[PDB]
Protein backbone atom coordinates (compact mmCIF):
# COMPACT_ATOMS: atom_id res chain seq x y z
CA UNK A 1 0.00 0.00 0.00
CA UNK A 2 1.39 0.93 -2.46
CA UNK A 3 4.64 1.77 -4.36
CA UNK A 4 5.50 1.35 -8.04
CA UNK A 5 8.86 -0.36 -8.80
CA UNK A 6 11.86 1.45 -10.24
CA UNK A 7 13.60 -0.73 -12.83
CA UNK A 8 17.21 -0.88 -14.03
CA UNK A 9 18.31 -3.29 -16.77
CA UNK A 10 22.07 -3.74 -17.28
CA UNK A 11 25.12 -5.98 -17.69
CA UNK A 12 27.50 -6.89 -14.88
CA UNK A 13 30.53 -6.04 -17.05
CA UNK A 14 31.09 -3.76 -20.01
CA UNK A 15 29.56 -5.67 -22.88
CA UNK A 16 31.58 -7.25 -25.68
CA UNK A 17 30.00 -9.45 -28.34
CA UNK A 18 30.77 -13.13 -27.94
CA UNK A 19 31.96 -12.60 -24.34
CA UNK A 20 29.91 -14.24 -21.60
CA UNK A 21 28.34 -11.74 -19.20
CA UNK A 22 25.46 -11.38 -16.70
CA UNK A 23 22.15 -9.78 -17.54
CA UNK A 24 20.76 -8.01 -14.46
CA UNK A 25 17.34 -6.49 -13.80
CA UNK A 26 17.22 -4.54 -10.56
CA UNK A 27 13.82 -3.68 -9.11
CA UNK A 28 13.46 -1.44 -6.10
CA UNK A 29 11.15 0.98 -4.36
CA UNK A 30 8.09 -1.33 -4.49
CA UNK A 31 5.38 -2.54 -2.15
CA UNK A 32 3.88 -5.05 -1.67
CA UNK A 33 6.62 -7.59 -2.35
CA UNK A 34 4.67 -9.82 -4.77
CA UNK A 35 5.99 -9.09 -8.24
CA UNK A 36 6.60 -10.86 -11.53
CA UNK A 37 9.92 -10.25 -13.26
CA UNK A 38 10.95 -11.95 -16.52
CA UNK A 39 14.07 -11.45 -18.60
CA UNK A 40 13.60 -11.43 -22.38
CA UNK A 41 15.76 -12.32 -25.42
CA UNK A 42 13.97 -10.98 -28.55
CA UNK A 43 10.59 -11.08 -26.71
CA UNK A 44 10.78 -14.67 -25.31
CA UNK A 45 10.93 -15.46 -21.57
CA UNK A 46 14.35 -16.76 -20.42
CA UNK A 47 14.44 -20.01 -18.46
CA UNK A 48 17.40 -20.22 -16.03
CA UNK A 49 16.81 -16.88 -14.27
CA UNK A 50 17.85 -16.62 -10.63
CA UNK A 51 17.09 -13.85 -8.17
CA UNK A 52 18.22 -12.37 -4.88
CA UNK A 53 16.75 -12.85 -1.39
CA UNK A 54 14.02 -10.28 -0.75
CA UNK A 55 15.17 -7.32 1.32
CA UNK A 56 14.15 -3.71 1.80
CA UNK A 57 15.33 -0.13 2.34
CA UNK A 58 14.85 2.23 5.37
CA UNK A 59 11.52 3.45 3.88
CA UNK A 60 10.27 -0.23 3.96
CA UNK A 61 10.22 -0.60 0.15
CA UNK A 62 11.57 -3.84 -1.31
CA UNK A 63 14.30 -4.58 -3.84
CA UNK A 64 15.27 -7.64 -5.87
CA UNK A 65 17.97 -8.51 -8.35
CA UNK A 66 17.04 -10.82 -11.22
CA UNK A 67 19.94 -12.19 -13.26
CA UNK A 68 20.97 -14.64 -15.94
CA UNK A 69 24.19 -15.52 -17.74
CA UNK A 70 24.22 -14.44 -21.38
CA UNK A 71 26.43 -13.86 -24.39
CA UNK A 72 25.93 -10.43 -26.05
CA UNK A 73 25.70 -10.15 -29.86
CA UNK A 74 25.16 -7.27 -32.33
CA UNK A 75 21.59 -8.37 -33.18
CA UNK A 76 19.86 -9.87 -30.10
CA UNK A 77 17.52 -7.60 -28.05
CA UNK A 78 17.40 -8.10 -24.24
CA UNK A 79 14.78 -6.72 -21.79
CA UNK A 80 13.10 -6.88 -18.41
CA UNK A 81 9.37 -7.44 -18.11
CA UNK A 82 7.91 -6.49 -14.75
CA UNK A 83 4.38 -6.91 -13.47
CA UNK A 84 3.11 -5.46 -10.21
CA UNK A 85 -0.27 -4.48 -8.74
CA UNK A 86 0.63 -0.78 -9.11
CA UNK A 87 0.79 -1.23 -12.94
CA UNK A 88 -1.97 -0.95 -15.60
CA UNK A 89 0.02 -3.30 -17.81
CA UNK A 90 3.47 -4.98 -17.52
CA UNK A 91 6.40 -2.52 -17.89
CA UNK A 92 9.05 -3.50 -20.45
CA UNK A 93 12.51 -1.97 -20.09
CA UNK A 94 15.03 -2.68 -22.86
CA UNK A 95 18.71 -3.23 -22.13
CA UNK A 96 20.34 -0.09 -23.45
CA UNK A 97 24.13 -0.89 -23.46
CA UNK A 98 24.42 1.69 -21.93
CA UNK A 99 22.25 1.52 -19.91
Amino acid sequence: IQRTPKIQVYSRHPAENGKSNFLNCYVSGFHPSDIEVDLLKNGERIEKVEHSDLSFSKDWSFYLLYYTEFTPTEKDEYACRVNHVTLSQPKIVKWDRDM
Binding site: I1, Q8, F22, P32, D34, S52, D53, S55, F62, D98
Partner: protein
Protein backbone atom coordinates in the same frame (compact mmCIF):
# COMPACT_ATOMS: atom_id res chain seq x y z
CA UNK B 1 32.03 2.17 11.35
CA UNK B 2 30.52 -1.31 10.75
CA UNK B 3 27.08 -2.90 11.07
CA UNK B 4 25.31 -6.22 11.37
CA UNK B 5 21.69 -6.07 10.19
CA UNK B 6 18.89 -8.66 9.97
CA UNK B 7 15.88 -8.13 7.65
CA UNK B 8 12.61 -10.12 7.96
CA UNK B 9 9.54 -10.19 5.71
CA UNK B 10 6.35 -12.18 6.40
CA UNK B 11 3.49 -12.19 3.89
CA UNK B 12 0.19 -13.83 4.79
CA UNK B 13 -1.19 -16.30 2.25
CA UNK B 14 -4.92 -16.43 3.11
CA UNK B 15 -5.93 -18.84 0.33
CA UNK B 16 -3.99 -21.74 1.84
CA UNK B 17 -1.26 -22.52 4.33
CA UNK B 18 1.12 -20.42 6.40
CA UNK B 19 2.78 -17.08 5.48
CA UNK B 20 5.82 -16.68 3.27
CA UNK B 21 8.81 -15.79 5.42
CA UNK B 22 12.16 -14.51 4.20
CA UNK B 23 15.11 -13.48 6.34
CA UNK B 24 18.50 -12.07 5.26
CA UNK B 25 21.49 -11.10 7.40
CA UNK B 26 24.05 -8.53 6.31
CA UNK B 27 27.45 -7.34 7.48
CA UNK B 28 27.69 -3.84 6.08
CA UNK B 29 26.77 -4.42 2.36
CA UNK B 30 27.52 -8.16 2.34
CA UNK B 31 24.66 -10.64 2.69
CA UNK B 32 25.93 -13.59 4.70
CA UNK B 33 22.88 -15.71 5.57
CA UNK B 34 19.39 -16.52 4.33
CA UNK B 35 16.21 -18.31 5.29
CA UNK B 36 13.20 -18.79 3.07
CA UNK B 37 10.10 -20.69 4.17
CA UNK B 38 9.53 -21.88 0.55
CA UNK B 39 13.06 -23.32 0.15
CA UNK B 40 13.84 -27.00 0.84
CA UNK B 41 16.35 -27.09 3.73
CA UNK B 42 14.24 -25.33 6.42
CA UNK B 43 17.68 -24.26 7.66
CA UNK B 44 19.56 -21.03 7.86
CA UNK B 45 21.89 -21.17 4.83
CA UNK B 46 25.32 -19.54 4.26
CA UNK B 47 25.66 -16.84 1.58
CA UNK B 48 29.27 -15.72 2.23
CA UNK B 49 32.30 -18.11 2.36
CA UNK B 50 33.52 -16.64 5.66
CA UNK B 51 30.41 -17.86 7.55
CA UNK B 52 30.76 -21.48 6.35
CA UNK B 53 33.60 -21.65 8.92
CA UNK B 54 30.93 -22.00 11.65
CA UNK B 55 30.13 -25.53 12.94
CA UNK B 56 26.75 -27.39 13.14
CA UNK B 57 25.98 -26.03 16.63
CA UNK B 58 25.89 -22.53 15.08
CA UNK B 59 23.64 -23.66 12.20
CA UNK B 60 21.20 -25.50 14.50
CA UNK B 61 21.01 -22.42 16.73
CA UNK B 62 20.49 -19.88 13.93
CA UNK B 63 17.93 -22.21 12.36
CA UNK B 64 16.08 -22.58 15.70
CA UNK B 65 16.04 -18.79 16.24
CA UNK B 66 14.97 -18.01 12.68
CA UNK B 67 12.04 -20.45 12.95
CA UNK B 68 11.07 -18.79 16.25
CA UNK B 69 11.20 -15.39 14.48
CA UNK B 70 8.95 -16.90 11.78
CA UNK B 71 6.35 -18.05 14.23
CA UNK B 72 6.36 -14.67 15.96
CA UNK B 73 5.61 -12.97 12.63
CA UNK B 74 2.84 -15.48 11.81
CA UNK B 75 1.30 -14.77 15.20
CA UNK B 76 1.74 -10.99 14.79
CA UNK B 77 -0.08 -11.01 11.43
CA UNK B 78 -3.10 -12.39 13.39
CA UNK B 79 -2.91 -9.73 16.11
CA UNK B 80 -2.57 -6.97 13.51
CA UNK B 81 -5.47 -8.12 11.33
CA UNK B 82 -7.71 -7.92 14.42
CA UNK B 83 -6.27 -4.59 15.65
CA UNK B 84 -6.75 -2.99 12.23
CA UNK B 85 -9.99 -4.93 11.94
CA UNK B 86 -9.37 -6.35 8.48
CA UNK B 87 -10.84 -9.52 7.00
CA UNK B 88 -9.10 -12.90 6.80
CA UNK B 89 -9.37 -12.63 2.99
CA UNK B 90 -6.60 -10.09 2.33
CA UNK B 91 -2.83 -10.65 2.09
CA UNK B 92 -0.82 -8.56 4.58
CA UNK B 93 2.85 -7.93 5.25
CA UNK B 94 4.97 -7.61 8.38
CA UNK B 95 8.57 -6.32 8.10
CA UNK B 96 11.26 -6.18 10.78
CA UNK B 97 14.81 -4.88 10.85
CA UNK B 98 17.24 -4.93 13.75
CA UNK B 99 20.98 -4.57 14.17
CA UNK B 100 23.94 -2.91 15.87
CA UNK B 101 26.68 -0.58 14.64
CA UNK B 102 30.24 -0.41 16.00
CA UNK B 103 32.38 2.68 15.35
CA UNK B 104 35.99 3.31 14.27
CA UNK B 105 37.09 1.67 17.57
CA UNK B 106 35.03 -1.57 17.04
CA UNK B 107 33.02 -0.63 20.20
CA UNK B 108 29.22 -0.38 20.36
CA UNK B 109 27.93 2.80 18.69
CA UNK B 110 24.24 2.26 17.91
CA UNK B 111 21.40 -0.27 18.20
CA UNK B 112 18.06 -0.41 16.40
CA UNK B 113 14.87 -2.40 15.99
CA UNK B 114 11.98 -1.21 13.79
CA UNK B 115 8.71 -2.91 12.77
CA UNK B 116 6.21 -2.21 9.99
CA UNK B 117 2.79 -3.53 8.91
CA UNK B 118 1.77 -3.11 5.27
CA UNK B 119 4.79 -0.88 4.66
CA UNK B 120 4.03 1.61 7.43
CA UNK B 121 5.95 2.27 10.63
CA UNK B 122 4.24 0.42 13.46
CA UNK B 123 6.64 0.39 16.40
CA UNK B 124 10.39 1.05 16.80
CA UNK B 125 13.01 0.97 19.55
CA UNK B 126 14.36 4.48 20.36
CA UNK B 127 18.05 5.49 20.40
CA UNK B 128 18.38 4.98 24.18
CA UNK B 129 17.30 1.27 23.77
CA UNK B 130 14.92 1.70 26.76
CA UNK B 131 11.74 3.13 25.15
CA UNK B 132 9.47 2.74 22.10
CA UNK B 133 8.07 4.99 19.33
CA UNK B 134 4.47 3.93 18.58
CA UNK B 135 3.21 5.29 15.25
CA UNK B 136 -0.53 4.95 16.01
CA UNK B 137 -2.95 3.71 18.71
CA UNK B 138 -2.65 0.03 17.71
CA UNK B 139 1.10 0.34 18.29
CA UNK B 140 0.37 2.26 21.57
CA UNK B 141 -1.17 -0.92 22.96
CA UNK B 142 2.01 -2.78 21.97
CA UNK B 143 4.22 -0.04 23.43
CA UNK B 144 2.36 -0.19 26.80
CA UNK B 145 2.45 -3.98 26.83
CA UNK B 146 6.14 -4.35 25.86
CA UNK B 147 7.11 -1.73 28.43
CA UNK B 148 5.26 -3.78 31.09
CA UNK B 149 7.04 -6.96 29.85
CA UNK B 150 10.55 -5.32 29.72
CA UNK B 151 11.05 -6.46 26.09
CA UNK B 152 13.56 -3.61 25.73
CA UNK B 153 15.87 -5.08 28.43
CA UNK B 154 16.37 -8.35 26.55
CA UNK B 155 16.77 -6.41 23.29
CA UNK B 156 19.29 -3.93 24.75
CA UNK B 157 21.31 -6.86 26.19
CA UNK B 158 21.44 -8.34 22.69
CA UNK B 159 22.14 -5.20 20.67
CA UNK B 160 24.89 -3.78 22.88
CA UNK B 161 26.30 -7.18 23.91
CA UNK B 162 25.91 -10.24 21.74
CA UNK B 163 25.18 -8.38 18.49
CA UNK B 164 28.51 -6.52 18.59
CA UNK B 165 30.47 -9.53 19.92
CA UNK B 166 29.35 -11.54 16.85
CA UNK B 167 29.80 -8.65 14.40
CA UNK B 168 33.47 -8.42 15.50
CA UNK B 169 33.82 -12.17 15.16
CA UNK B 170 32.45 -12.00 11.63
CA UNK B 171 34.68 -9.04 10.73
CA UNK B 172 37.84 -10.84 11.82
CA UNK B 173 36.82 -14.12 10.13
CA UNK B 174 35.86 -12.29 6.93
CA UNK B 175 38.60 -9.63 7.05
CA UNK B 176 39.98 -10.51 3.59
CA UNK B 177 36.70 -9.14 2.01
CA UNK B 178 34.72 -7.28 4.69
CA UNK B 179 37.66 -5.04 5.65
CA UNK B 180 38.91 -4.58 2.05
CA UNK B 181 37.53 -1.64 0.06
CA UNK B 182 37.17 -2.12 -3.70
CA UNK B 183 37.64 1.32 -5.18
CA UNK B 184 35.50 2.21 -8.21
CA UNK B 185 36.79 1.44 -11.67
CA UNK B 186 35.84 4.70 -13.42
CA UNK B 187 35.37 5.80 -17.03
CA UNK B 188 33.31 8.22 -19.19
CA UNK B 189 31.06 7.84 -22.24
CA UNK B 190 29.85 10.33 -24.91
CA UNK B 191 26.33 10.07 -26.43
CA UNK B 192 25.68 12.50 -29.33
CA UNK B 193 21.95 13.17 -28.83
CA UNK B 194 21.83 15.78 -31.67
CA UNK B 195 24.29 18.00 -33.63
CA UNK B 196 24.16 20.65 -30.90
CA UNK B 197 24.24 18.74 -27.60
CA UNK B 198 25.79 15.61 -26.10
CA UNK B 199 25.48 13.49 -22.97
CA UNK B 200 28.53 12.73 -20.85
CA UNK B 201 28.21 9.81 -18.52
CA UNK B 202 30.46 9.12 -15.61
CA UNK B 203 30.67 5.51 -14.45
CA UNK B 204 31.60 3.92 -11.16
CA UNK B 205 31.85 0.11 -11.36
CA UNK B 206 33.09 -2.82 -9.24
CA UNK B 207 33.30 -0.87 -5.99
CA UNK B 208 32.54 -1.76 -2.38
CA UNK B 209 31.05 -0.60 -0.08
CA UNK B 210 27.89 0.80 -1.69
CA UNK B 211 28.39 4.34 -0.34
CA UNK B 212 29.70 6.54 -3.15
CA UNK B 213 29.38 10.18 -4.28
CA UNK B 214 29.30 11.29 -7.91
CA UNK B 215 29.12 14.99 -8.69
CA UNK B 216 29.53 17.11 -11.80
CA UNK B 217 31.41 20.39 -12.22
CA UNK B 218 31.30 23.05 -14.97
CA UNK B 219 34.36 25.29 -14.92
CA UNK B 220 35.14 23.99 -11.40
CA UNK B 221 31.67 24.70 -9.94
CA UNK B 222 29.07 22.15 -8.83
CA UNK B 223 26.32 21.78 -11.45
CA UNK B 224 22.96 20.08 -10.85
CA UNK B 225 20.72 21.18 -13.72
CA UNK B 226 20.44 18.89 -16.74
CA UNK B 227 21.98 16.04 -14.74
CA UNK B 228 20.67 12.60 -13.87
CA UNK B 229 21.92 10.23 -11.14
CA UNK B 230 20.77 6.58 -11.02
CA UNK B 231 20.27 4.69 -7.80
CA UNK B 232 23.30 2.62 -6.81
CA UNK B 233 22.88 -0.90 -8.09
CA UNK B 234 24.32 -4.31 -7.30
CA UNK B 235 26.66 -5.77 -9.91
CA UNK B 236 25.72 -9.32 -8.77
CA UNK B 237 29.22 -10.39 -7.65
CA UNK B 238 29.19 -8.47 -4.35
CA UNK B 239 30.13 -5.09 -5.89
CA UNK B 240 28.10 -2.08 -6.91
CA UNK B 241 27.67 0.22 -9.85
CA UNK B 242 26.51 3.77 -10.34
CA UNK B 243 26.55 6.47 -12.95
CA UNK B 244 25.86 10.14 -13.37
CA UNK B 245 25.21 12.00 -16.61
CA UNK B 246 25.01 15.61 -17.76
CA UNK B 247 23.73 17.17 -20.97
CA UNK B 248 26.21 19.63 -22.43
CA UNK B 249 26.49 21.86 -25.49
CA UNK B 250 28.48 20.23 -28.27
CA UNK B 251 32.16 21.21 -28.30
CA UNK B 252 32.01 22.21 -24.58
CA UNK B 253 32.73 18.78 -23.11
CA UNK B 254 36.07 19.87 -21.56
CA UNK B 255 34.52 22.42 -19.16
CA UNK B 256 32.83 19.52 -17.38
CA UNK B 257 34.51 17.33 -14.73
CA UNK B 258 33.06 14.35 -12.86
CA UNK B 259 34.07 13.92 -9.22
CA UNK B 260 34.02 10.63 -7.40
CA UNK B 261 34.26 10.21 -3.60
CA UNK B 262 34.61 6.74 -2.10
CA UNK B 263 36.15 5.17 1.03
CA UNK B 264 38.63 3.14 -1.01
CA UNK B 265 40.00 6.25 -2.77
CA UNK B 266 42.81 8.05 -0.87
CA UNK B 267 41.90 11.35 -2.67
CA UNK B 268 38.71 11.98 -4.75
CA UNK B 269 39.11 11.28 -8.47
CA UNK B 270 38.36 13.64 -11.30
CA UNK B 271 37.54 12.77 -14.89
CA UNK B 272 37.21 14.81 -18.09
CA UNK B 273 36.50 14.34 -21.82
Amino acid sequence: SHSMRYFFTSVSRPGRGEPRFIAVGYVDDTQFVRFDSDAASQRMEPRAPWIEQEGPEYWDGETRKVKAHSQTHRVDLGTLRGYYNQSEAGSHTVQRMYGCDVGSDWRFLRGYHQYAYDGKDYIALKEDLRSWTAADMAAQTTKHKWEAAHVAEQLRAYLEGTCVEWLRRYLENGKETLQRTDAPKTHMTHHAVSDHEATLRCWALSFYPAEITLTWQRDGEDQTQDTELVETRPAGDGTFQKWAAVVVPSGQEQRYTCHVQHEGLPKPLTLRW
